[model samples]
Target: MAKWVCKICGYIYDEDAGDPDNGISPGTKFEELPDDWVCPICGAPKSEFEKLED
Candidate 1:
């Protein structure tokens, strides 16, 4: 699991914490999200998020 950063709002998506509030269960990978998934914080497109290197 890794962390993805939203360039628009600096929101960090944690693979371990998933966005349960938004229906994304914990342990869900970034690729597991569909195009309909947007940033829970800034509502930015999924394409706008950047993967963080380990």
Candidate 2:
């Protein structure tokens, strides 16, 4: 699994712990997210996210 950060609010989306409150389940990969999915914190789109290096 991978993690990505929101460029707008520094919100980190951890694949191991998907945003369940946002309708995303655990173990869900960042690429598997819906195109309209946005940051739970800042409401920014997925395009504003960047993968983090392990």
**lDDT per residue (tens digit) for residues 1-54 in model 2:** 888999999999999999999899999999999999999999999999999995
Highest TM-score against the true fold, candidate: 2
Against the correct fold, how does model 1 do in TM-score? 0.92
Q: Give the Cα error of residue 52 in candidate 1, in Å.
A: 0.7
Where is model 1 more than 4 Å wrong at Cα? none
Best candidate, lDDT: 2
Global lDDT of each model? 0.93, 0.95
Candidate 1 lDDT at 28 equals 95
lDDT of 1: 0.93
lDDT of 2: 0.95
CA-only RMSD, every prediction: 1.1, 1.1
